Design a protein around this ligand. Sequence first.
Ligand SMILES: O=C(CO)[C@@H](O)[C@H](O)CO
Ligand SMILES: O=C(CO)[C@@H](O)[C@H](O)CO
Ligand SMILES: O=C(CO)[C@@H](O)[C@H](O)CO
Ligand SMILES: O=C(CO)[C@@H](O)[C@H](O)CO
Ligand SMILES: [Mn+2]
Ligand SMILES: [Mn+2]
Ligand SMILES: [Mn+2]
Ligand SMILES: [Mn+2]
Ligand SMILES: [Mn+2]
Ligand SMILES: [Mn+2]
Ligand SMILES: [Mn+2]
Ligand SMILES: [Mn+2]
Lengths: 385, 385, 385, 385
Amino acid sequence: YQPTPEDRFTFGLWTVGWQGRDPFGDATRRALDPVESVQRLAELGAHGVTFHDDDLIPFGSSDSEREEHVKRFRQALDDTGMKVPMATTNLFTHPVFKDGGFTANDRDVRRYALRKTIRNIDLAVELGAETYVAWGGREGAESGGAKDVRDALDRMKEAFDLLGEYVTSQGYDIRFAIEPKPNEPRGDILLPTVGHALAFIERLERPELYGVNPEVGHEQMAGLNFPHGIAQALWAGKLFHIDLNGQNGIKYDQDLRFGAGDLRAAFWLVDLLESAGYSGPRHFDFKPPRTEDFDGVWASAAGCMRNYLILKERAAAFRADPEVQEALRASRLDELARPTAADGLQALLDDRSAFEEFDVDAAAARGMAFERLDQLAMDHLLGAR
Amino acid sequence: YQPTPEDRFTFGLWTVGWQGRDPFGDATRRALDPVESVQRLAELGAHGVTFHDDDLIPFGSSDSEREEHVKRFRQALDDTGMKVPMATTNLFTHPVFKDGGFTANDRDVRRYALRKTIRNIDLAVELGAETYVAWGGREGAESGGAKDVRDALDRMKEAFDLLGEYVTSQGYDIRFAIEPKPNEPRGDILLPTVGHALAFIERLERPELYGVNPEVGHEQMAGLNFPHGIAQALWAGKLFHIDLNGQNGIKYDQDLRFGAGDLRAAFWLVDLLESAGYSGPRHFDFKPPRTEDFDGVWASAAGCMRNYLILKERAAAFRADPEVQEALRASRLDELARPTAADGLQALLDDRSAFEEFDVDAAAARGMAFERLDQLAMDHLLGAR
Amino acid sequence: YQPTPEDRFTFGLWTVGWQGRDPFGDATRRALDPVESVQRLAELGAHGVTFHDDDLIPFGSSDSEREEHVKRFRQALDDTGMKVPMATTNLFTHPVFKDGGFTANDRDVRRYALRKTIRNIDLAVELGAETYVAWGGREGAESGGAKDVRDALDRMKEAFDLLGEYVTSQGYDIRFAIEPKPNEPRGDILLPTVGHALAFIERLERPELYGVNPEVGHEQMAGLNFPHGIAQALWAGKLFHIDLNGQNGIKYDQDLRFGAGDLRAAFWLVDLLESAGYSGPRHFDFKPPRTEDFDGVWASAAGCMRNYLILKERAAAFRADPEVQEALRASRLDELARPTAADGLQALLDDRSAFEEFDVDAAAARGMAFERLDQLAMDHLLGAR
Amino acid sequence: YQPTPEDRFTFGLWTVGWQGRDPFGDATRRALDPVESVQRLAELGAHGVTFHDDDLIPFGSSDSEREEHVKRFRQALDDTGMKVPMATTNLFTHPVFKDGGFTANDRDVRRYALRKTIRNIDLAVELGAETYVAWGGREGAESGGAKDVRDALDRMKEAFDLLGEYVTSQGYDIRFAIEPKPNEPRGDILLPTVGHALAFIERLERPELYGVNPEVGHEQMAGLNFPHGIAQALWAGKLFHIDLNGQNGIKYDQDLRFGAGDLRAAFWLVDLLESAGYSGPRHFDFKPPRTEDFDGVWASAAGCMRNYLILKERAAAFRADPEVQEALRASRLDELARPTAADGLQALLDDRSAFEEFDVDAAAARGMAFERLDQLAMDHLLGAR
Ligand SMILES: O=C(CO)[C@@H](O)[C@H](O)CO
Ligand SMILES: O=C(CO)[C@@H](O)[C@H](O)CO
Ligand SMILES: O=C(CO)[C@@H](O)[C@H](O)CO
Ligand SMILES: O=C(CO)[C@@H](O)[C@H](O)CO
Ligand SMILES: [Mn+2]
Ligand SMILES: [Mn+2]
Ligand SMILES: [Mn+2]
Ligand SMILES: [Mn+2]
Ligand SMILES: [Mn+2]
Ligand SMILES: [Mn+2]
Ligand SMILES: [Mn+2]
Ligand SMILES: [Mn+2]
């Protein structure tokens, strides 16, 4: 199950580059040069990398150092054929961001956040990114009086409307993807789930420029079904990008390699991405555990891609099995896809078979046959089929 | 802290009427006649009651029994001055609903669900309800292959579009409020949070007919900040109705009396409802614990209203305290309410004070003074102020 | 992967016999006669069944009806060769139990709970059970003032000490297994996890008569690692019995068939049970979803056993693979099993290589190689090995 | 509500000294000198401070620097009258600890962990500590094959037995308190709750030397009732020390000031500590949010003490109110405290009023009156009484 660049696997610089500093411990690994990560990921079969501004150009770099970091990076992409499909801004590490970027209470900080963002959109375009992610990890509060959330959503809409004005003014071909997270590092983060981010987008001045970048572990931090939230984002036409990883339930954001965590959810997510024909990058936002040395980093990144390809093969064998197609009909999945009342309202109202003569007891007695379908899915996942 | 009808407190018939049957135990209380609940709630100071169809007219009642249940009920409302501001449909108890109402896999059941719904909308209008709630507690799945969620959202949009066609065709003055819940009784429920329900509404044919009816305990079942989700529903103009209760964290849906559960969240929710001027019903969707007899039922319903009125007084004393107004300025809440860039994009781009000459270290060093503000809020809640 | 009676798979009568009544819905299946469940489970390859008193003899049965229910049951066990390795008492359904059995505030109810229990211990012995489970699902509270927990633990120790006096007085060969659950149906249940139940046992008059019956879904309702809690129960010598099922995270108690829920946890649990040589029953405490008819009931019960046998084969292939044995040495699992200081305290204190001359930087730089080990485990589980 | 040293309030050096580095951000505050924290806490009314070795003497300090840090510290305690009732070891920050201290897979690291521990026990004794805490935050795993937990509990018992040998050999008057935490920074931490730590202690060679140091936010990270776990630790005689703080549900470890988080749980915890007569330190293990400057640090530490004193006054007014004493009798709290069967087993067995003539329906019909009791508790907490 060997990845190639045609599988569209991507990685953040900050993922394999995570030094292992956690809330309770020092770094366990030395910093990697971005050039070295590009080379090593290209050897494992990835298609490309992504970056925050500050991963690529150290905070406070002069214009001359900037251009040098960029030139070196561009050389490694040329040398390897790696692409950069997505970029984002760090509006969370520097102390100035301690109360947020776009929704900081201090107006001066909010203007600074927008300026730092627009400078990186230009860079992203130059390097060919098609998607610009926004994770507002510092937007929110630990206490109720610290943040009026209606005012905060006004400031958040204002920031995103200004960015959509900027891109359209420049004539760039870049769309935005907002990434929800329910908590951590703030006590509560604004737009905490995919549903909250989708609903927010519909109030922007140009909603067609914005979609979501959901992350597996983030929706599971709220105990939600990740494949169900992705189906809603697909239904709305707003799955612009995705972050793949693993999480063991409701606790701190673990960012385990993809396939770790909830393995059945991983299976039904691949099933959905492949059957809806998602064609964006398969991006891993993960942290090799701090127990690992460099060898363990590259083994963890390789397992991300391996697990995706194994689950892809098992979900395709599941949907291709005639015995599964028969079970799906037995459970009336075909009937869920037909209109309830294509005949229209008046006809429904006049239909005695829908009410006055509907035999509720006979309908109630029909089993759904879901457990037999779910064991076929289990047998397929385990290769016991 | 005595409620009057002017406080707009309402209760479902199923709340004080809960017989105490749980997944592991039999009923501990006899059934109440709806007429008796109307009388007892009017004595405690409530403004009105709400109902599912099946709470008021027993499932399978003939037209003659129907009209009799309605006449008796109408007499008790006349006798007490109680109103009925909201009604909803039971699409969850009868076995026919075991796979959903509007998104059941069986198309016949979906048509039946719409017919049962429209019959109750007529009744609701006749009794004067202004809001019709929809809680799809059976819409969802315990396993991944049982429900294609894109098809299920197609069927859910189809159902709600047909209901909006019906109400507009009849010329009724009734709006719909969808109530999210993340799980229970299904393994995962579709539109599991306020954000998911808001985003869904924006894809209906006539979005202006639909809002949300969030419930305190339901968002806390996903570990989310209830006051933050209500602020987003207010920001979108979609807070049509609300269900008030208490929940102790992420576990089964407890439906404790309001003020039980997370008491600080209760305080910041009342603070928000009163400061945004929400004018809908203050409705309690709660279950007096099955340990209680009838005396304990009416004591629990009275505590719902008492706790709301105490929290209202403390939140108003908080916002009225000059020392709190000073702390809010100290924490720059005034600055969060001002536009970040009313000057426009070009001016922001030309402003050297926003970037090239912005002193990040001086801005970073400014404390937010949030803990002093939050202890003032604590002192106010406890009356230690 | 066909089960036989030698695999020691057992089922509660209440599991396949669950009629599908949930907090929001009516029964979707008719009641099964215990005789019919015995016959059907024996056909699928189970080894035996378990019962609460009230599953086998309807509450309030006269002595004559009692003896008749027992005789019929005994005939079906004779006809099939099924055993009864475990029995328990229903101290949760009847309204009298609304505040608990052994820790009800009313003393009369507590004495009644003990009498109902002892009557069923006699029956259990007669039918050959070796383990008597105690699940105190009504022991706990929805509010802080309702239960003094020190007094409640006094009453709980008193009840269990009286039962251990009874069994020793009668000379029965039966041990007790307490089953923890953190909540539901009470707001909080006493002894909410395996750790709490283990610690409690050590304060009983004869601790050797009591162990734990942990359930997969119950520890995961507190977000805990089920295999880690079982290793602690094994370490203490107190794994008397186990309840196998599946749960999707922190929410209501789902009781899905075994292998559903957290599939990797299922794998590491089988790995542990088989490698520590657990020889008790493999008992399924699960509920076929209420979407199912009778066909779906027996398919769900068969999948419990199938999934156990598949995971058993994959965990055995994992531990048998030379490449895995090499990885375990690479990650120093062999060193975890050696004493840290068999040399004794004084020698440790005099050892300069343990402190004064210990090279912390060289030790820190050694990678643990855990991600490579965990991908081997993944490949084994998926059959991609 | 002004604290004095007689209230026994203590703080870790690492609490007010937290620089605000989180998994996503840099420090927002400069480091404090321990001498300055001693002085500032003594001014706010605290009784004493606690320390990890590495908070007081920077890692890798020579013997001469060691003695200097100690002398300066001792001078500040002399100058202020502050005591040091508890000390602990840092076995979590340095990279060498990435797989644990006492249960690291590498045996050399385990011996190093014990040596670093024993050196700090000597210091703790010299400074007068009576309790030595052990928080094994690095003991556990992110993956199932990385840690055999039976071997890991063998190594953990071996470490604690060696420490109990050491203290008894030296004739020190110091006891150990193990602090549970369910996760973070490891995926799962061993002995994850108070129940797990209590049960473990009973397998040590000298159990009387060891108790628990439970933390409010840690049990709530597993969704458990903190006051119920403290009642069990009190019931076992093992509440040696306690860590007070606040947490908003199941998510990362927030360490908010005490009274933040779950305020009703805070009330019932103070009620319990004061009514059982706990006489150890009231220690705050909290982090002033990184939004704060130094002024906000000392305001947050003062609110910890203020909130404790307010809750103490409200819980004492609750238990002193004659109307509450009457409600407690109405809910049969007096009957929970009487033996169920002081008459003995034989008498219970011969008592027809316990079974054959027990009127279950009359007992079932008695209401518990818990909601009226719980609203009295609410009125008391809010000062509405
Ligand atoms: O998810 C996280 C942090 O939780 C980030 O890696 C975003 O994806 C990009 O800033
Ligand atoms: O919330 C619930 C069930 O959880 C219902 O009472 C809805 O409010 C109306 O059907
Ligand atoms: O676990 C449960 C209910 O949650 C019971 O089936 C016990 O196992 C036996 O009473
Ligand atoms: O609780 C924590 C970290 O979560 C520590 O402060 C311990 O109390 C002492 O090491
Ligand atoms: Mn993440
Ligand atoms: Mn991400
Ligand atoms: Mn509810
Ligand atoms: Mn509701
Ligand atoms: Mn269960
Ligand atoms: Mn069980
Ligand atoms: Mn903590
Ligand atoms: Mn602590």
